[PDB]
From Swiss-Prot:
Signal peptide: none annotated. Stage 13 embryos display expression in the dorsal epidermis (at protein level). Belongs to the dwarfin/SMAD family. Homotrimer. Interacts with MAN1. Interacts with Sec13 and Nup93-1. Residues 3-186 form the MH2 domain. Disruption phenotype: Mutants exhibit defects in midgut morphogenesis, imaginal disk development and embryonic dorsal-ventral patterning that are very reminiscent of dpp mutant phenotypes. Ubiquitinated by Smurf upon phosphorylation; which promotes proteasomal degradation. The gene is Mad. Required for the function of decapentaplegic. May play an important role in mediating Dpp signaling. Involved in the BMP signaling pathway. This is Protein mothers against dpp. Disulfide bonds: none annotated. It is found in: Cytoplasm; Nucleus.
Amino acid sequence: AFWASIAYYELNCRVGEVFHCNNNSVIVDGFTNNNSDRCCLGQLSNVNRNSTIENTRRHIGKGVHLYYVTGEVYAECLSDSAIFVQSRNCNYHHGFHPSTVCKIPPGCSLKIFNNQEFAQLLSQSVNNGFEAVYELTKMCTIRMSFVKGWGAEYHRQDVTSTPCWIEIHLHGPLQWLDKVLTQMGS
């Protein structure tokens, strides 16, 4: 019923409740002043907040727009300020460092998830060990931050280093994975 679930974070401390998307076209903004399709970060709260965070939480602006189609996810940077994505899947696709972090230019869009490759990987690994088919678990979760980058070619080198970011859990890919592990024993 929910293709995914975005959990918002501030540095290393999670913030607000997990948002579940029962829509396919879901926007994640940061503006201010209840709303199905939109997931607004701006109406959230944190005390551990501060200047360094306050400042970034204003550049999120139009934020990001995630699209789920046919079993594939897309991300368009609606914010006047960049967006940084790290998807093991999106990477494996373009043959990137499996940990590469992708900068989606304001106005731009990128396919952070391809289901076809996934199902491929999955079956391509079932006959390759359990622990293998399991780490494919790491693929069902994408993590994107706002404004400030991280990982290689950045001062910040782990998402926890950024003032704000999200975590997107792809249930579809997670579901199968289980069903595969399950049948890998009985």
